[PDB]
């Protein structure tokens, strides 16, 4: 239902097809993000999604996932689509900042915690 | 390189197209039938414009290329094939609600649509 995944994939292809290095701005504060906090700045990390800087990159409707190496330390990165803030070309900044969609809001996310119930029955 | 990057339209058209279909919507395309290179049933054009149904059941061998769109469709029984230059695709939306996107103008599309003031020899 959310359009963000299709728009991200569209820009990604346009970037790569034009020989641009696609940079993804991630809200490392969002629910489910999995990135090395050692490289996070002000609740925000910028990733390189080019073929070269990624292993097994997958751009799903629900998440971005890939193997990344930070100073020899290869590992997996998981980013829920709701955390993707923007994607642009490293060589010139051309890209898009994703428009907010109501569904990536925890209010629209199914109950993460249950209702106050008694105990006895 | 003064940075002569290609148009984004084909990518946006394609993505929105996939979004509509994956959501059970019927993709409708608004075309400028004037645009150089367009091949569509001239008698179904209104105000130099034609709306087309691109859903799976309304098309055959649909091709959403960076440069053009092409497919086979039937108009009142008469099966015809259409060729549409990307600069001619003006918008794509969902029939079930009139909600979609109207593409932003892109400089090169305008260039590819500049007409000569006069004809060629012969």
The CATH topology name of chain A reads SH3 type barrels
Portion in helices of chain A: 10-25%
Kindly report how far apart the N and C termini of chain A lie: 40 Å
Highest-level CATH class of chain A = Mainly Beta
The H-and-E topology of chain A, N to C, reads as: HEEEEEEE
**What coarse outline of chain A follows from CA principal-axis ratios?**
globular
Spatial extent as radius of gyration of chain A:
17 Å
Protein chains sharing the most extensive interface = A-B, 14 and 12 residues
> Which sheet architecture does the biggest sheet of chain A show?
4 strands, antiparallel
Indicate how many domains the architecture of chain A comprises: 1
Return the CATH architecture of chain A.
Roll
Strand content of chain A: 25-35%
Number of separate strands of chain A: 7
Q: Would you tell me the structural class of the helices and strands of chain A?
A: mainly beta
User: Can you identify the CATH superfamily of chain A?
Assistant: SspB-like
Helical run tally of chain A: 1
PDB class: transport protein
Keywords: ssrA peptide binding protein, homodimer, transport protein
Assembly: dimeric
Entry title: Structure of the AAA+ protease delivery protein SspB
Structure description:
Two copies of one chain form a homodimer. Chain A has 121 residues and is mostly beta strands. The first copy, chain A, has a single domain, classed as SspB-like (SH3 type barrels), CATH 2.30.30. Chain A is 12% helix and 32% strand. Chain A contains one helix and seven strands. The first copy, chain A, has one helix at residues 4-17, and strands at residues 22-26, 45-48, 55-59, 63-70, 73-80, 84-89, 95-97. In chain A, the strands form two sheets. Chain A has a four-stranded antiparallel β-sheet with strand order 2-1-6-7. In chain A, a hairpin with a 2-residue loop joins strand 4 (63-70) and strand 5. The longest helix of chain A is centred in the first third of the chain and has 14 residues, at 4-17. Chain A is globular. The interface between A and B is medium-sized, with 14 and 12 residues. Chain B: This is Stringent starvation protein B homolog. Chain B: Homodimer. Chain B: Belongs to the SspB family. The PDB classes it as transport protein. Keywords: ssrA peptide binding protein, homodimer, transport protein.
